[PDB]
């Protein structure tokens, strides 16, 4: 099965775009699917090797039973929404997902014209991020954010379907959650403070020790280990956005894994909490807005299409 | 004097910020003013040499008044509504501008970031436009955008205010215009359409020949000879922005020269219209929704 | 497992193209330089990595293998098939050897063909010697972008090596060369539409015409071609631009890489011959053939067993 | 299994650390090993994709025994001293090997000095050299310097235990010898007459042919066949490094295998010769002042400690 | 006031070299053109900026000077003096008009020369066409360093602006052209040391020979020149290697620029009639010249009040 | 106008630093190498541009200029000034010749200092030799930003280059050296806050800190100088990291350029004896100095007609 490029090399910008299928623009989608390898190409051949375009398209669940008749990816569902003591995370519409990513924002740009200008009239949008990553891999957070994604075979094992829904091999599930920051507050924090949230040293990225490591910080909430002991991995590439004058500072969440549960439960850990911990400290600093759930088929399973 | 970086290397992006300055807002932002060179070391230092960041501030004449006593630059004056038969050129508010460039969006932001957050509770934000150029320098209509622009000696002749105003010596003036595309009626013309709208080759950005470039093609209305014969000239950085799920597909333009003159007999020939031409036909495709001028002083004038 | 030779290199933005024929009597000399091409590629471009990206493929044609080599022979190894259309031909020109080197820069490709040029003085006389350069958006001299629809990753593997279905050669493949000259002066005369109605694709954005508008005589239009069981049958070409500007020389330096040569010339049939609906590739009303050469490129573990 | 990152793109820096471990040092060494992949992910994410930060980690005979209960590395002996008719290749202390690799010298010299800070106390320093290869992947002899290394398959073939030590798969063997050079010597020869040491040409770094190559050349000593006839591979990773104040201008050499006979078995050619060479002639401008071998084992088996 | 020529381009690894003679009734077509060329050189390479690097040096031969304007002719344009010594001779060729043209890859060059060539049509005959490359480390053809000795900053604007001496022409140059061929074969057969002797460098460290043992017939030692005052005397060189490996062409296409002929004059004395000291320029026993031309690089602004 | 050395240089990542004192007898030899070091940084530098940004600035001191030459000397040379403060001292050690290498890899500054070294082999004595590397986002060893309030432009050469106040020396400089150690393990101890307060700037953002909060003690308040007029006093600083993790060696090599070593002492007085507001600079509590030097850098002619 030849995958999708959610596997993707380092990228400084990226585009998501979420739409929902209004009532009878299935065919105009469909025709659409089956194409986009071939938009992708035309926009990003020309700028090579630096370009570096992908998009990577997902579908929901509500979605998947309007456009294919026959079978369904076994873990594919609504995302689940999440009402704690004191943080929620949303649902939110969205029947397809594009997540367009380059070296640079015009090639995204390009890209996202010419699938759209296919889509008009079938579609209506519901949400457009555009993102850049800081030049030392930071966040809006001021910390380093993706250390800890796994890499090369390991990835591999982590993010693409397998055996267990074989005519589904090569697919994944991305989970996407827009969040602001509530800025004033965590700069009124002091640099330790910031980091007892986080669970990692500031200037230099290194983990705290276990014996300083706090229960409710967010690498303690995000680190899972399974049945057999070995730890669960899923594959980030959050992108910081925001516009200066309305004060709005974000970060766009995307997460993928070979099946939902293990997003699943790491989210039910940072909202719900834990016997150690209400809830992960980062929350008090960062508010959901949106929640969908999506998979990302094969490339040939979108070709094939009409 | 030394100026500004108005004459800034080739930049892929751009912030432009507009505020208007609250009552009671004068102190803080001259405590701002005076810290703007300060702030734009710190954020761009460590990202050298590949990250090319500056910022150029500009001052609105309706502010200067608030700001400052003794003299005002002699050509500062609120930007000049034009009314023409078809087209119009609206005047918006603003009292400073904020043109931030850069290799990479993320130092604008971060730049942008730190201005805005001394200015909080003196100003209110007008406009904030991200931009971005494609790979090879065009522009959301698909022509190269910047090839006349002047370098060097003569750039320096067409930008920087000299000895007709010594006190303002090394200042320049800035004219900002948001333009909104029709994008599918650009699309709906042939190339050769498009080239004579514009007056230069697609592909090859090469200038139409006279006899070939018509009246109303913008390179022919945009092209202004002074008293002497020389070419009157100035210095564009024009930046592509927009939005897909809205449609919203623009150029903010920005005009730099010596004196707001310059600039402003063009574009009363692009939307008032000569004897030969009605109006600039790039304005067939391009609507104008703001319009602001500025002063950007010399970078010691700043200091003190 | 037979290492195939450098077919499917990385981008390079620079190739000299060399082919050579053997001299009565210098076979020879030629077998002991065949046995050291490997190692010369590395002494060459090791001091330039990792961005030079210096290969050197190496073909050899039929009449010339019967005179270097005893035994069996690859199942598809014949002379060029010159094409005599109503209209437009295609030649036969002489070949024995094709040097293809492939660089990020030119030196790097004159200093490996110094090298073998240097062995082979006396064995052989030079054919042809082409020095090509990529524009800095992928176009060729016609204007338009070239290579968008090549196959990539484990697609152009299955399209470009000989397998199971000859396995002695397994890890080979069949490279046909053709030197065109365009009459540029006849194709600036066409508006950017009639243009984009030859080729097939739109000539800024590189976005193939809707099959509603696309001339069954476009280039794109002949050369797709559906084998029995409905697979598309692909070829892997690396076009390079070459020219002199003093003597009004404007060429494009063909060269396809396949499998199996049915492929290569199931499609040169199309354009030079014509089917039902189409009389000709319209694209060969500005581009005049003047060589042509068919070429059997080994697996490297052949070449180094010598 | 996941190996280390034995087989590195091009790094034009490097730091080599060798430490021994002191009385009660084993705990804090342990906790370390399990440690290490996570500090060279937190030094070098953020400086990528320009960084290429990696750090190998090998382990010597004597210290494996204290550290590890059970099986051991089928090949993994002390370093052999080699007491030749003219040279000698020596043997010197080592438990801990840190091969630091990246495209800048200070990312090396982070990781170095979070890896030390953890192992104060526990740990003797017995060498450590900053290593910086020249523009041009020239030597401090002035030629071009891991030419016909192995890539690909050939490569991981060469250097990446398998089926023969099935419980230490992904695994391989260093050696490493730091050479101080006699540069004024080296540079009385004619560009020719170094040529002839060597192997290749010096400007183009084209092999001399067989006929003209000498028997106690460099290229000639280090050409072993197998029983196959088949070559045996070794990956080098050779790197200059020099004070112009103390006139030092040396090699740190080191070199990965499977096993160590193939490395051994050059060893034994170079300082001790054959029927035809008495030695490797480069050995006439180049004094061998350490040697250590190691075993780096897969990442997987680090990180479970 | 003066703007010149880029005259002092930054380095550059490609280049083109035309010289064409104006055809009888040309005259028209070439003054219109030379009007424009800095409106070319904008439209091909802006779009390319700022790694293009893009530009034309052009100039204009003492004899078409008096076909083309009238009144004044710098005072030091004359044709390029043929030199007969014992062993060696400088041929001089015909040349009308050179377009020395500069970028940092060979397809920016070649749009330009299109250009030009295509507005010269019918007025202008070809009389030579190189394409120049670099090697990565500055060598020539030879394997020695090419540039080093060049002057830089001050003291290269110094050497190579015309100023109050000539006020009419302030800011031109003159530039000396001569394509050489070398005998590789003979080159080769020389030690490195003996290399060294011709040169009076060493080959690859580029470390000058101390004055004692540095041959006086060695290259650097008879273009090395004193002036009456006792200071040096420079030029500064653009030389390009350029080649066919088919027909055994290795070349130096040499460049040298300068405030007045007669530096470059006294140097092309010293190395083709010799010294009390020296019968000739040792480099000439392995470098034939065959073309030979002078040529006056206006100031820009002389080109475009046209 | 006379041309300076390197002293206004593009960032470099890496630095040598020589130190030597001139033995008895050595005089002559020292000289001649003065002659030459223009040569050999062309030399060593031209093969490896434009990325190798290689230069050499060198320094004498002046005990050593009165052996050297004869005649006038620069108004501001004399020996460092030792510092004994109530804590801190600032040691006087010897250095007659100081060379300043500079470069985008160590191994280029390496090569340059060989040649240097090797010609004075049997007159010098070296007293210092330091290898330095300077961290990718542009921190020092304390993990501040080091250079940012660096004059640039024309304010940079004001600052620098001695002018019409010593025109003999016209177009000179003063250079101070000192080689500081740190104590890392009682830095690492502070609160970012608190090396915030030791500095004067923020440690992640570089944004200098307000003036009332800013403390009278910290190293940004005792380094600013104005003058009689009012004027800000001006040098220009490339320090650079050193070190040896096994002997626990962590350093900043300050070196700092100014017109007159008058602004770099009186920094140096404030820094050490402290003001009426602040006994020393803080950063003094975690840095000792053990070399201290004073040099003159002369115009690059000076060196060159000797
Ligand atoms: C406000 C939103 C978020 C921010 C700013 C954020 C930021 C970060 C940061 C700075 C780290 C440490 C470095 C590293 O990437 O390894 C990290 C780690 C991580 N985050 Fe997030 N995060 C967010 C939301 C989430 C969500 C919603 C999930 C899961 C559904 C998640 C999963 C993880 C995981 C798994 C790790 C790695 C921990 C480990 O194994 O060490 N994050 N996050
Ligand atoms: C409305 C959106 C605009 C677009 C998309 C646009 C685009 C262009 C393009 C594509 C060129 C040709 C290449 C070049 O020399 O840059 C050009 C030239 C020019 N534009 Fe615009 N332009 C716009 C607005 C303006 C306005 C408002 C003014 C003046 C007030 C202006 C003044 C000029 C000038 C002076 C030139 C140079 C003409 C010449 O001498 O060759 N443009 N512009
Ligand atoms: C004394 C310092 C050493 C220096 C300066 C040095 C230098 C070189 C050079 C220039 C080459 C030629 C190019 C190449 O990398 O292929 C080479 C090749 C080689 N060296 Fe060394 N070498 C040293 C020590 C060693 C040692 C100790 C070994 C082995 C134990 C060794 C094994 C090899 C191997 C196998 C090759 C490849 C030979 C081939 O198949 O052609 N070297 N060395
Ligand atoms: C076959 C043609 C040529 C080749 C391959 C060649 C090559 C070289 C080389 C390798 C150098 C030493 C490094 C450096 O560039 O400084 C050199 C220097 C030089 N060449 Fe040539 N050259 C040629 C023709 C010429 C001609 C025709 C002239 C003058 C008309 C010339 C003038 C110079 C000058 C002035 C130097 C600088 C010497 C000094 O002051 O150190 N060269 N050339
Ligand atoms: C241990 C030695 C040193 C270290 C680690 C160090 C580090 C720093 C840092 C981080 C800055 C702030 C950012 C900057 O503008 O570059 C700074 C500024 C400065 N340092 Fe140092 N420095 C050291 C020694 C010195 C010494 C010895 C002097 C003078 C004799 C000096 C003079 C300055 C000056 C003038 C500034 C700029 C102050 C301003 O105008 O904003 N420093 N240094």
Same mark, same amino acid.
């Given at each position: 099965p030849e995958p999708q490029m959610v596997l993707s090399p380092?990228?400084?910008?990226?585009?998501?775009?979420?739409?929902?299928?209004? *009532?009878?623009?299935? !065919?105009?989608?469909?025709?659409? &699917?089956?194409?986009?390898?071939?938009?992708? =190409?035309?926009?990003?051949?020309?700028?090579?090797?630096?370009?570096?375009?992908?998009?990577? $398209?997902?579908?929901?669940?509500?979605?998947?039973? =309007? &456009?294919?008749?026959?079978?369904?990816?076994?873990?594919?569902?609504?995302?689940?929404?999440? !009402?704690?003591?004191?943080? =929620?995370?949303?649902?939110?519409?969205? !029947? &397809?997902?594009?997540?367009?990513?380059?070296?640079?924002?015009?090639?995204?740009?390009?890209?996202? $014209?010419?699938?759209?200008? =296919?889509?008009?009239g079938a579609v209506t949008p519901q949400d457009e991020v555009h993102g850049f990553k800081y030049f030392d891999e930071r966040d809006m957070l001021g910390?380093? !954010?993706?250390?800890?994604?796994?890499?090369?075979?390991?990835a591999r094992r982590a993010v693409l379907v397998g055996a267990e829904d074989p005519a589904f091999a090569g697919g994944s599930y991305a989970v996407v959650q827009k969040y602001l920051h509530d800025i004033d507050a965590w700069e009124g924090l002091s640099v330790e403070a910031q980091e007892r949230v986080i669970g990692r040293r500031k200037m230099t990225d290194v983990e705290l020790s276990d014996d300083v490591k706090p229960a409710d910080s967010h690498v303690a909430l995000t *680190?899972? $280990?399974?049945?057999?002991? *070995?730890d669960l991995e899923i594959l980030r590439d959050n992108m910081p956005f925001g516009s200066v004058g309305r004060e709005e500072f974000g970060?766009?969440?995307?997460?993928?894994?070979?099946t939902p549960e293990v997003t699943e439960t790491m989210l039910e850990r940072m909202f719900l909490g834990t016997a150690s911990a209400p809830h992960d400290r980062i929350l008090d600093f960062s508010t959901a807005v949106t929640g969908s759930l999506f998979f990302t088929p094969a490339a040939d399973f979108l070709e094939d299409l009409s």
């Open positions: 380092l990228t400084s910008a990226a585009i998501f775009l979420v739409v929902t299928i209004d *009532s009878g623009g299935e !065919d105009t989608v469909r025709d659409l &699917l089956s194409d986009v390898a071939s938009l992708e =190409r035309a926009v990003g051949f020309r700028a090579q090797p630096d370009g570096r375009l992908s998009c990577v $398209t997902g579908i929901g669940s509500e979605a998947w039973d =309007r &456009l294919f008749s026959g079978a369904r990816p076994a873990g594919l569902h609504p995302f689940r929404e999440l !009402d704690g003591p004191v943080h =929620r995370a949303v649902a939110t519409p969205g !029947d &397809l997902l594009f997540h367009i990513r380059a070296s640079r924002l015009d090639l995204c740009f390009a890209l996202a $014209t010419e699938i759209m200008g =296919r889509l008009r910390f380093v !954010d993706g250390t800890e994604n796994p890499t090369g075979a390991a *680190s899972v $280990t399974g049945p057999d002991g *070995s970060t766009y969440f995307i997460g993928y894994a070979r």
